[PDB]
Amino acid sequence: LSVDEEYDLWKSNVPLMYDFVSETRLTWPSLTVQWLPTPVQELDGGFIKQELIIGTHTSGEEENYLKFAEINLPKEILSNIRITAKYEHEEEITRARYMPQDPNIVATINGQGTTFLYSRSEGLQSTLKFHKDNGYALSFSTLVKGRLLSGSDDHTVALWEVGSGGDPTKPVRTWNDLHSDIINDNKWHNFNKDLFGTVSEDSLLKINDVRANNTTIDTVKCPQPFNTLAFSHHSSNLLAAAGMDSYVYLYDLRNMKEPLHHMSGHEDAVNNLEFSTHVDGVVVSSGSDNRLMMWDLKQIGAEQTPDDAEDGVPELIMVHAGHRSSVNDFDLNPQIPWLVASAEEENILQVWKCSHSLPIV
């Protein structure tokens, strides 16, 4: 099939597979997507509203913006898009994340490794300069307000504190010794306020402790490099990582010698990873094969009929094939289970929810 031939095929089956799908063309492509934790509120007209943070990438032709988008969804999801805020930005926005403890604050990082603190109500607040080249890694502790972790192509990792007074433009701590190549991703643990994880182009995955002088507790060699990792929101031991070899790996923090398992489905590198906050055991992945895939860890190794084994491993719940290019980023909505926002290279953002007929939902 061609990608356009395949797209019409996917579109012809949308009513059966999805409760909802909406597609939106962006003037410029976004590299980042996050739902805001804005509570479900029904509006006049039988719509419920949600908010979305997206960014721009112009490759230098125009100016870049941090954008805030209003999404009006059908009431039965328990319908257009609208940019309600638009702030100018220095270079492309490679990642943008809201502070869990204060959603008026959005942290961004750009293609030169500069980190920004934006306010929804006032705009650009602070500039956090340390990394000297582009960075894809940016993470807020969900456990300590203002604790920010950034990472760059220049092999460096920085810890900042932004959830107080004082000057936040200076890192509380930095590391030049964690990895010897590009930092692909870093994430805080969800139960241990001191733990974080790093994955690098040097084929290492590291579990680290901010309190310790010798930061690293665990070093793991990765088949090929991992581009992303995610921690469980339910298990304090379970994590997942994936990258260039297409497999999604699970690890137990108590014993990182070997992975628990790896899940096969992607036909190219995996770029983003996420655990569901809503359902323990659900992992969603995406990457260069233009696909999003949802996984169920509880079906790992389950018995199948041979006919079912042909559609993929038992842990694969669903494949999203609505995109026509590599997936830049996606996010799982924290208020409405199974609602997803995903964005592809060719200036398309889709918003979608799988069918309620899926056993998992």
Binding site: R25, L26, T27, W28, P29, L31, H57, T58, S59, E61, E92, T94, G111, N134, Y136, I182, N184, E201, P225, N227, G243, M244, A269, N271, S326, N328, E345, E346, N347
Partner: peptide, 12 residues
């Protein structure tokens, strides 16, 4: 290991 894209505008 991600490969940042070249950007393009909208054909209308």
């Amino acid at each position: 290991a991600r490969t940042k894209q070249t950007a393009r505008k909208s054909t209308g």
